[PDB]
Design a protein around this ligand. Structure first.
Ligand SMILES: [Cl-]
Length: 299
């Protein structure tokens, strides 16, 4: 049961490289605007404690070298929107897809087109952790790469990678420059806080395991939401809400296993472990498939 990324074509024609000083990173070219992390304007000394307003005032349009494939895009304007830099250029991207900017919730998933210096290298499916970090070693060289979902014909951009925290975990913003989580684009000590397991996603993955024949872990017990959540808190699982129950509706309907029934099976797995067995070929419970993801990749 494999992670699936959205097809990346519509985003590939939007990826450009942005250089300021010694720093090159990735930028997103939509219409006549290139979006990228504002930390591109910082020198290594600047990053310790940048005044971005003052730094941005020192820069001129010619300080920003933007290139799409071959043609290099003349920057005719530079503006800051929270933590994203907006480089206005004199050419609208002819490959611009229908798109929207959306802010996602912790636990939601998205595809990242990982790029090096403007060039697409690969696509990865990830999740926004409960603590608003993104797990994924590939983001180390991919500053300015973006995360997205495709909803019908529209690319919904939800993430732009900005930095690694001193622990190594990855942090970024929505496309209007607001960080996910309590993080700032400054090179200083910053803690992400306890990450937890996305409970509703584990339940969705257990349903996928049932749909694919893997059902040894089903027991006959049931549970109430309150009793389950007491167990969940113990193992650093996120609390399950009635909204999460409703979202799991379609999967219960297809399988015939009520949601609280499945919660009782998960409780038993949390208390007892798997005793050396696997589920969907995994020895650990997977929490980076959403209920929508499982629905989409089953029928
Ligand atoms: Cl059960």
């Amino acid at each position: 049961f494999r992670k699936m990324a959205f097809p990346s074509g519509k985003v590939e024609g939007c990826m450009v490289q942005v250089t300021c000083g010694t720093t090159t990173l990735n930028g997103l070219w939509l219409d006549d605007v290139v979006y990228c992390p504002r930390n591109v304007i910082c020198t290594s000394e600047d990053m310790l404690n940048p005044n971005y307003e003052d730094l941005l005032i020192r820069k001129s349009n010619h300080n920003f070298l933007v290139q799409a494939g071959n043609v290099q895009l003349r920057v005719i304007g530079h503006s800051m929107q929270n933590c994203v830099l907006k480089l206005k250029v004199d050419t609208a991207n002819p490959k611009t897809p229908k798109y929207k900017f959306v802010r996602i919730q912790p636990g939601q998933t998205f595809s990242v087109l990982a790029c090096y210096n403007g060039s697409p290298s690969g696509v990865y499916q990830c999740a926004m952790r409960p603590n608003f970090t993104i797990k994924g070693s590939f983001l180390n060289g991919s500053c300015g790469s973006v995360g997205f979902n495709i909803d019908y014909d529209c690319v919904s951009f939800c993430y732009m990678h900005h930095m690694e925290l001193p622990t190594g975990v990855h942090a970024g913003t929505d496309l209007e420059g607001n960080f996910y989580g309590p993080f700032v684009d400054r090179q200083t000590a910053q803690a992400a806080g306890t990450d937890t397991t996305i409970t509703v996603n584990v339940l969705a993955w257990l349903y996928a395991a049932v749909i694919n024949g893997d059902r040894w872990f089903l027991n006959r017990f049931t549970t109430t939401l309150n009793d389950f959540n007491l167990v969940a808190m113990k193992y650093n699982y996120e609390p399950l809400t009635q909204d999460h129950v409703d979202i799991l509706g379609p999967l219960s309907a297809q399988t015939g296993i009520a949601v609280l029934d499945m919660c009782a099976s998960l409780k038993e797995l949390l208390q007892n472990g798997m005793n050396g067995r696997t589920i969907l070929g995994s020895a650990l419970l997977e929490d980076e498939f959403t209920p929508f993801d499982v629905v989409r990749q089953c029928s």
